[PDB]
Symmetry: C4
Subunit: 43 residues, 4 copies
């Protein structure tokens, strides 16, 4: 069963790398949203 | 296999931190989107 | 070790429920984004 | 524990499907955000 647990650890870390990237992309969306809102506010 | 099991548990704790971040950022984004839509729509 | 694997299955399903909710929320963001873009396009 | 291990593998496959969706939707959102920002900015 150690062969299977080995595959699980590897896949979890691969999927986490993907979620990590997603997290970075979401930060950009927030910053872009704030910029868009400012273009719509008098200043 | 206890060593492998420990690795799995720590990856899950790491993943939880990431989901928490995605969840809170998602809220910030949607609230921003609604505000932006309102700035463009007849009130 | 069955006690630990039991906790892993439960936690994975709990975290997936969270990702499932996130997925639904993201669909809304896309639909909201399309509506915002249309308010900015002549028609 | 092989039965529990199988449950874990299937949850991971389910999670992957979800991450794939989040990843593709995120792209659609950012491209929309950039287009919206452009519609509001001097070109
Ligand atoms: Sr988003």
């Amino acid at each position: 069963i150690e062969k299977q647990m080995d595959r699980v650890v590897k896949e979890m870390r691969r999927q986490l790398e993907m979620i990590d990237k997603l997290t970075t992309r979401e930060i950009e969306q927030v910053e872009l949203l704030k910029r868009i809102y400012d273009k719509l506010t008098v200043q």
